[PDB]
């Protein structure tokens, strides 16, 4: 089900903008117990972002969750 992906997205978004920024992403990661540096966090975005905007959109979010 893709609901799992939507659920994860809902947990990531901190307002309902539909565009997960590095700040919101880091917030969730830190809450999970993952303490990474500025570079490490940005790297995650740089790999997920295919457009090259500086954030992860719904489409890219779905692809990253299905990555292998």
């Amino acid at each position: 089900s893709e609901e799992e992906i939507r659920e994860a997205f809902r947990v990531f978004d901190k307002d309902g903008n539909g565009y997960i920024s590095a700040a919101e992403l880091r917030h969730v990661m830190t809450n999970l117990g993952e303490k990474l540096t500025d570079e490490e966090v940005d790297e995650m975005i740089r790999e997920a972002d295919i457009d090259g905007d500086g954030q992860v959109n719904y489409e890219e979010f779905v692809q990253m969750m299905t990555a292998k």
Binding site: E4, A8, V11, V28, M29, L32, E34, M64, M65, A67
Partner: peptide, 12 residues
């Protein structure tokens, strides 16, 4: 990893 993230996220 991304897969591990979805796993732990579901735990909490």
């Amino acid at each position: 990893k991304l897969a591990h993230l979805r796993a732990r996220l579901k735990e909490l």
